[PDB]
Amino acid sequence: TLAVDEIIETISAITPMAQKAKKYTPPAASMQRSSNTIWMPVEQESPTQEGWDLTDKATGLLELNVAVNMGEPDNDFFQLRADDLRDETAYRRRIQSAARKLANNVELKVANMAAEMGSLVITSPDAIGTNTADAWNFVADAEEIMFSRELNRDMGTSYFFNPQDYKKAGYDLTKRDIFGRIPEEAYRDGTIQRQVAGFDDVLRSPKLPVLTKSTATGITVSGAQSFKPVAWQLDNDGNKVNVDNRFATVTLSATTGMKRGDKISFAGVKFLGQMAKNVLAQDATFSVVRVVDGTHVEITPKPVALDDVSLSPEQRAYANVNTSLADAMAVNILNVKDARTNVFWADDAIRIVSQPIPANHELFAGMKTTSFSIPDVGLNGIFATQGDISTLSGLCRIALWYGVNATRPEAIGVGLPGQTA
Amino acid sequence: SPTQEGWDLTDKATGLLELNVAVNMGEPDNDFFQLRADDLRDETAYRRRIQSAARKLANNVELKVANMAAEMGSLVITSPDAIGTNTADAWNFVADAEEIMFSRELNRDMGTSYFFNPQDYKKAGYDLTKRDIFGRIPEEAYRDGTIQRQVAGFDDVLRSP
Amino acid sequence: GDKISFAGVKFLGQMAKNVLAQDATFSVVRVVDGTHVEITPKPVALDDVSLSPE
Amino acid sequence: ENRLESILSRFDADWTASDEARREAKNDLFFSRVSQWDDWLSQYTTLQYRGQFDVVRPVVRKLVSEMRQNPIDVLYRPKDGARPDAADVLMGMYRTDMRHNTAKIAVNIAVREQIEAGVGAWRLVTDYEDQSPTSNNQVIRREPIHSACSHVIWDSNSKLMDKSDARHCTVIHSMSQNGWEDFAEKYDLDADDIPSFQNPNDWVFPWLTQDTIQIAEFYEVVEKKETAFIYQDPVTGEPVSYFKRDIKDVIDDLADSGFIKIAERQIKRRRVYKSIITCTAVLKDKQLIAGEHIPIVPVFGEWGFVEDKEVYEGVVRLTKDGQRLRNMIMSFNADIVARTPKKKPFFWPEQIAGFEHMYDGNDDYPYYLLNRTDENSGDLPTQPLAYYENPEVPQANAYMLEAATSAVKEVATLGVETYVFQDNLATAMRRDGEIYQSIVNDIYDVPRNVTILMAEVVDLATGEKQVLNDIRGRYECYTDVGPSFQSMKQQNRAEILELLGKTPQGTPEYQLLLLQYFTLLDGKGVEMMRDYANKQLIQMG
Amino acid sequence: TLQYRGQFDVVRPVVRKLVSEMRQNPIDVLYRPKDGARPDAADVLMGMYRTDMRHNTAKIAVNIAVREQIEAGVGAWRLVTDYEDQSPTSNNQVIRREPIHSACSHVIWDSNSKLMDKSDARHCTVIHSMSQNGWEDFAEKYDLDADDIPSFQNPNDWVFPWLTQDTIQIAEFYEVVEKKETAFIYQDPVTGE
Amino acid sequence: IVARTPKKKPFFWPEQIAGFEHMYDGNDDYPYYLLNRTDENSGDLPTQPLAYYENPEVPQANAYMLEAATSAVKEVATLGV
Amino acid sequence: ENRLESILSRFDADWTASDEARREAKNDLFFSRVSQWDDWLSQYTTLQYRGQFDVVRPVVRKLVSEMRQNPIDVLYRPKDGARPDAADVLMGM
Amino acid sequence: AEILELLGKTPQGTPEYQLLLLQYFTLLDGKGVEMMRDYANKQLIQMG
């Protein structure tokens, strides 16, 4: 048996979304007592009254907020036998592969969260390679829906194609019967362009999810409902507890065939100009976040109605939907067919909270803990090693404690080509 | 490597697995000559036959490489029609290959190579030339015969006879 | 050198384990018997419950 | 595109590229400092004797003492065709700010690390001082770096012993909680955000894992052509070249002082930028620091490249196998000595039945009695008495103890002498001198000597801050190696004594004796002698 | 199965002693005037050589070459020129000596050379191996396309459990051409006919 | 050879030390060693001198070749005189 | 915030950081000064002979005498460019 | 180095004094060695 040290490298993955996502490291000492949840305010919107005599019409101040928290460690526990030779030959390569897999898992979490809590939904009735400049139209629809809603894009925007649609865009570019500079670039290399239709970062991602179609049909809103912006509310004991602004529990006729990730739109509700409060020509799109009970769901954009008479003026200043729900409004599902999602967002919509695992303390004697800097994704974990003779082995564990958060779900989007049938 | 989540991981560790592949050599590609003392008063034929054997051995090496690559090749991109029909067909071929490699996330650090047969290379050149425009790439494909060295993101594109 | 593809079997991402949209394509390298073949990509399934985590 | 991502990619490349050498150097340092039984599994369980019969440590002690007996320090010397006093001020400044205990301690630490593991390093920093500043209310000092192998990470594309061709370097700083608070207070960071950075990632012991905090400093060198203003000095001469980046807050005040701009050239040179980082974030981005070179000076032992892969070795790497074998054999011999039955007779119980108190070890009897008969066999069988064999050290054990000791002694012979190590330290000190000259030119106040006196040309801005003015005629001296002196007066005394050692008893001998009395320290009697020497020299003219 | 494999060196002290002995006796060029020339005709050349060879890189390269000569049998170094502005030697330029590691596998001399110093060698190829960042550096310095990663005959060998090795290779091919070229005979207005 | 080789210890029949096994474990609590004498079927325990496992030994060939190899290296690793 | 708590935290951090070296140094002092037989866990038997035939103490004595034969004291010297007798007062003090 | 090599082989005549003065001339610079070199230069000039 002849054997060498030559390695046949087999995989090489890329992690653009995790790299681009901002990473937050709040103080662990305070986070320990705050139950790993920290609250951040939201940009304040003020009401407006016009007239001369405004007696007893003075409003109040209302500032809503969101909350960001984390999950559980994403470890690489594995036991290593000392006597075996195929383990000594493989230990260090296993450590390297563990680092790469942890980075890949972080990227997968980012992509899935972005594609599942993306309020803005752009859909197409056919494939991208159907008409000329259809990929450009797909990007421009997203850019226009972000522009019309007046969403803050100071940090920057991003658009991630899946490889199939990226290839379709390149094919559309190269079938132009001409060669300027963009067509020659799209011919020599597969890249369409670094900036398209107003986005300042257009990339392709191999780890974008596939949005399986929803079997839900014939669902109507059960009972007229009103959702009111609020910052805190009183609990049973009278204490004021904060309220997250990126959720709203609606009651439907029956939540069968719905899951986390589907996109819905009620018949009648229309988007607003956020700051200016002008009715748009586009249907309001929501993403169902959690299917609680059997007749309720939780949608991520809270549907504050401009025509709601039960809203105080300061609450109505935050309205993003031109009307409320009226006990019969049929809800149309938007993902009626499987499609690998293209995902666009504002760069300050997805963040990655991270925390240390203080296993270097004097409490954990008998085991050695050091730090472990993940490449690609810029994160820290711990690398802990312990021994054992009850099995004559050693345990190695690479732990990483973080959590992806979507602070502005109204900024993230989802592109769905070919949503016919 | 496998991966798992959670804080308490008692009796949930994992072993180490390292797979391997086998590489082998075949039999030599020989060439025999037999000559008498009479036939070496010129030696010109001797040297020429030596050089011809060198060239033939090189060509046989490349033929073996071509056959092995075309036989033990997993990924296959099939098209229902020829490569000369409709526009950008060859580019679509190369893009399909690059896209399937990227989606499978295979390692391409050492470079990627595409090889056309002479007929398909000619059809790709014809596709470029008939483009009803001559900016730089159709002009090159018309004056010379090459389409381009890099196509659809592949690190190199050649024509194997 | 024959190229085959089993129905209902699709490629994976090989790092992220995401189901691709392309049917898995194998190449036979040797026909040992009248009922046995040898395919060069070993089809390690993802849903196989007999596979250890490693 | 991300600055953090680029920094981390470069650091990861270097960290993975310098991996094997780092682990071997860490193993050598641990072996020579903590314990020779570097086993992570036998730190528990049922115990067995494991001795430490060290035979390599005296060699390391002897080499360290031999290299400490010969101190080495930078020596600045004038160039060719320049003024003969072109290095007096620079040498005085160097001796001024390198006479403190910190510089000597850092050099000694680096030297010890170079002998034991194979690589050491130190750092040059600039700090603000007001009580005793060297020049321009600043001081330049030398700081130590412990475990340079796992704490200083160099550019992978470097092919020089002193790493002068490297373009970036990552230094990992480790500090306690209070130290991190001090660091954050000094660099205007946030104390609540505790940083972290990659660690050596070893197995050896559960302890030595002190609860610390790691941060990274990324030094990068950029070589570029920058605008430089040629001025006219209103006190002497005319051609005087200044850099625009330095002369930017006093540009208006230069004209008021009396400088008139003559031309504007583009001069190529290097700048060093430092970044304070963690893995997850960048705290300080591109803080420009003084000097042209990265302020880290490495010292190497046996250094080279095998296959584009750096290898550095000390004196302990090759003795490890023999030392471990020797320790194992001694432990086996100790186990043999103790857990072995002694030499005692073999008795049937019937033989000594009834006389059992005659064999317990007392000396109350003149002989030992035995039973003779049995009631069934008539007579007890006769067999010569046997004694348990004495414990013996196996010939294999003795032979291999001798062989392992001899092998360690044979292989632990650096050189014939530490000449190669001293030459490597001299190379490191030459690099240190280059770095210090660059920093002095950048921040200090170097007075130009005119043959018509030291003319210090400076100016102040509206914010009461003084900006140094250094002409481009700054590299008038080069670097060499000489004996370590605490002051220029000591250097002059040594030179005078060396000259007196070779000058015969002529009139120059009297001249040098008077000069030696001149250069003496002060009491009262030596004060009188120095006054006499002064008077005699002035009288002789 | 794992078996004991010790290492009891007895050659390494000899190499250390030889390297120390060769280090105790440095050797450098010395320019001397020819026969019948001015007695100080080599002063300027000697001064310039010392000025641009007094640095650290020259000594380091010589030491590396000496160590490789002692151990493997062959070493090498290179002489390069660069543009310097702050402290030039002459004509705003400097001449510096640089090291070559693994000269046996990285310097490939002309096969038709029968001289120890290889002065009759007429071509010589140097293989430069670098990683990604080193390749970016090389392309930026020599004005090359950093996108198109180069490749060449790899002179390295994966014989140790190294986690990674250099993957980018390039070659510098020096050739010497001896030819008759036109010269102009002028009249120097100062003195020189 | 030094490591993996059985040590020098006596060879015992189980019946010779049956009941006295704690006298040979290496302790120092007894003044002698007792051995059984009688067998209920064989009458008397057969007499034979006690045998011991031979001590580990480095072969003469190993010693000679180690010395010869070291001497050859010392003789051939002399650059010049 | 509490001065007591800050001081105690600093002291505890340093005390736990220097734990191993202090233990080894205390063991070295006990070994070199009092006795080389540390037998309190060995109390599961009767009384046995425990001799002390030192061979390390003469080495320590020789080293101490050698370092005592060469006294070292501070010496103040004037800085470069200062007055020649700038350190006489400090040296006298 | 060349002056020292000459001085090591020149017997103690007038060339010995010449070479000693030359070495003092070519010596490095401080303050005391500056005075010695100035004296050597003056002596050489006065000797012609």
Side-chain angles (χ1 to χ4, degrees), chain B residues 22-87:
Chain B
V23 293
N24 54 85
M25 321 195 58
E27 290 277 55
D29 227 14
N30 297 245
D31 190 11
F32 251 85
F33 329 124
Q34 171 105 356
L35 272 196
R36 203 156 52 129
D38 280 338
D39 317 306
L40 281 167
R41 271 168 311 174
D42 209 355
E43 191 188 358
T44 69
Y46 175 71
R47 311 177 296 101
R48 294 185 179 138
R49 179 83 158 63
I50 294 276
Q51 305 176 1
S52 283
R55 284 201 271 300
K56 169 81 85 172
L57 289 198
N59 278 222
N60 287 350
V61 152
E62 194 275 359
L63 205 33
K64 284 219 183 94
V65 178
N67 264 276
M68 161 68 50
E71 275 153 21
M72 300 204 14
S74 150
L75 318 168
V76 54
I77 288 100
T78 58
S79 202
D81 40 18
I83 217 164
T85 86
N86 81 34
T87 321

Side-chain angles (χ1 to χ4, degrees), chain D residues 98-362:
Chain D
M98 295 277 175
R99 80 169 43 115
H100 300 123
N101 252 350
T102 322
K104 291 196 119 269
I105 283 169
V107 170
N108 288 340
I109 293 166
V111 153
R112 217 212 154 183
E113 294 223 346
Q114 143 200 14
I115 288 130
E116 282 171 351
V119 58
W122 67 72
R123 190 167 68 254
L124 287 115
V125 301
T126 86
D127 216 3
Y128 271 98
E129 177 87 17
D130 326 291
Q131 284 221 98
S132 57
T134 298
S135 200
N136 213 307
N137 287 254
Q138 287 192 239
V139 290
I140 295 163
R141 46 168 59 105
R142 194 147 54 198
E143 314 212 297
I145 298 185
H146 294 275
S147 325
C149 45
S150 40
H151 272 50
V152 198
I153 283 132
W154 287 98
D155 193 36
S156 184
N157 200 72
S158 197
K159 318 258 149 198
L160 277 183
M161 181 157 346
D162 60 31
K163 314 272 191 213
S164 39
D165 53 21
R167 288 137 30 254
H168 58 78
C169 168
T170 318
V171 179
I172 303 158
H173 272 149
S174 282
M175 60 205 37
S176 52
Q177 168 56 243
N178 191 243
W180 156 248
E181 273 174 11
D182 193 343
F183 206 97
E185 181 68 281
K186 176 219 262 238
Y187 281 105
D188 278 293
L189 304 181
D190 197 350
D192 324 298
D193 167 39
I194 276 170
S196 34
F197 206 62
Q198 174 94 43
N199 257 347
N201 255 6
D202 36 23
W203 278 70
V204 48
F205 296 138
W207 56 287
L208 309 109
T209 204
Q210 208 205 147
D211 182 21
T212 57
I213 291 167
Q214 332 266 328
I215 219 177
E217 276 140 288
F218 195 79
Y219 302 89
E220 40 194 277
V221 152
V222 152
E223 173 147 51
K224 270 209 321 218
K225 273 171 144 114
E226 33 196 275
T227 299
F229 288 169
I230 313 281
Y231 275 100
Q232 176 151 20
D233 201 299
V235 188
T236 167
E238 162 203 296
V240 168
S241 192
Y242 288 174
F243 281 119
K244 198 220 64 169
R245 270 275 253 119
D246 309 326
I247 315 304
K248 207 162 42 73
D249 36 16
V250 294
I251 168 68
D252 41 87
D253 310 288
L254 261 286
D256 287 345
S257 157
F259 283 73
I260 39 161
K261 184 144 39 96
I262 264 49
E264 160 191 316
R265 301 286 169 257
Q266 291 267 359
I267 277 143
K268 188 163 76 38
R269 64 151 301 190
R270 274 161 299 161
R271 263 141 170 81
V272 195
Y273 304 99
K274 187 191 62 154
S275 315
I276 318 198
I277 49 147
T278 82
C279 191
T280 77
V282 175
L283 314 180
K284 301 318 218 204
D285 210 32
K286 268 192 294 284
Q287 180 187 335
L288 162 82
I289 45 170
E292 249 205 86
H293 316 267
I294 295 203
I296 292 106
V297 180
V299 199
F300 285 101
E302 300 176 27
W303 158 94
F305 272 63
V306 177
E307 271 145 10
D308 315 70
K309 279 270 155 152
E310 216 201 286
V311 288
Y312 37 86
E313 202 208 307
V315 83
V316 197
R317 192 155 320 180
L318 301 178
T319 80
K320 278 197 306 195
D321 299 89
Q323 174 77 87
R324 283 204 262 263
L325 261 199
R326 164 181 221 280
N327 290 333
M328 151 185 158
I329 279 142
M330 296 293 276
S331 319
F332 280 4
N333 286 6
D335 282 26
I336 278 174
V337 162
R339 341 180 49 188
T340 300
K342 325 261 164 221
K343 187 186 92 179
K344 273 170 285 185
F346 284 96
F347 279 130
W348 291 336
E350 310 233 278
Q351 274 191 328
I352 57 130
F355 309 112
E356 288 109 337
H357 47 280
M358 281 179 162
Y359 307 90
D360 54 349
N362 52 52

Side-chain angles (χ1 to χ4, degrees), chain B residues 1 10 14 41 62 64 77 99 103 106 108 115 120 138:
Chain B
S1 97
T10 311
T14 305
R41 271 168 311 174
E62 194 275 359
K64 284 219 183 94
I77 288 100
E99 181 274 300
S103 307
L106 309 171
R108 302 159 309 145
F115 305 87
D120 270 9

Side-chain angles (χ1 to χ4, degrees), chain A residues 323-394:
Chain A
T323 199
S324 35
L325 320 160
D327 201 7
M329 255 187 210
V331 46
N332 314 337
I333 76 160
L334 308 170
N335 49 296
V336 299
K337 190 198 274 314
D338 306 88
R340 208 166 310 269
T341 64
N342 317 293
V343 164
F344 60 94
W345 65 38
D347 259 359
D348 49 300
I350 284 281
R351 71 183 28 201
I352 299 189
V353 194
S354 166
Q355 283 304 40
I357 320 192
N360 324 296
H361 194 252
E362 47 173 295
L363 209 54
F364 314 80
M367 85 190 212
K368 157 149 263 196
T369 317
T370 47
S371 279
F372 194 70
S373 62
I374 307 288
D376 275 341
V377 202
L379 285 166
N380 254 95
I382 84 183
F383 174 100
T385 50
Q386 188 154 47
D388 189 4
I389 210 161
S390 325
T391 176
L392 246 183
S393 285

Side-chain angles (χ1 to χ4, degrees), chain E residues 56-161:
Chain E
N56 245 353
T57 165
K59 320 226 156 302
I60 288 175
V62 167
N63 290 339
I64 302 178
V66 162
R67 217 217 156 181
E68 299 229 349
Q69 167 208 20
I70 279 139
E71 279 171 354
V74 54
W77 71 79
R78 200 160 73 251
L79 292 137
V80 290
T81 86
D82 211 0
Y83 272 102
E84 189 109 346
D85 274 77
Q86 280 219 84
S87 48
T89 278
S90 198
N91 201 349
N92 274 256
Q93 292 195 241
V94 283
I95 278 164
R96 50 185 91 194
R97 164 187 308 145
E98 289 190 341
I100 293 193
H101 293 101
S102 303
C104 42
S105 77
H106 279 245
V107 183
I108 300 196
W109 283 101
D110 169 36
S111 45
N112 197 228
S113 191
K114 330 257 160 194
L115 259 165
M116 173 163 350
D117 56 70
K118 287 160 173 33
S119 41
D120 45 358
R122 307 169 321 160
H123 60 252
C124 171
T125 165
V126 178
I127 305 188
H128 275 107
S129 93
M130 40 202 62
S131 57
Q132 191 45 64
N133 44 280
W135 164 237
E136 319 278 342
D137 301 345
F138 203 88
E140 173 87 74
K141 166 166 42 203
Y142 285 110
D143 290 332
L144 304 174
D145 193 338
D147 285 342
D148 207 344
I149 279 153
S151 85
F152 203 61
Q153 162 73 50
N154 179 59
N156 309 5
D157 251 354
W158 215 310
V159 303
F160 203 64

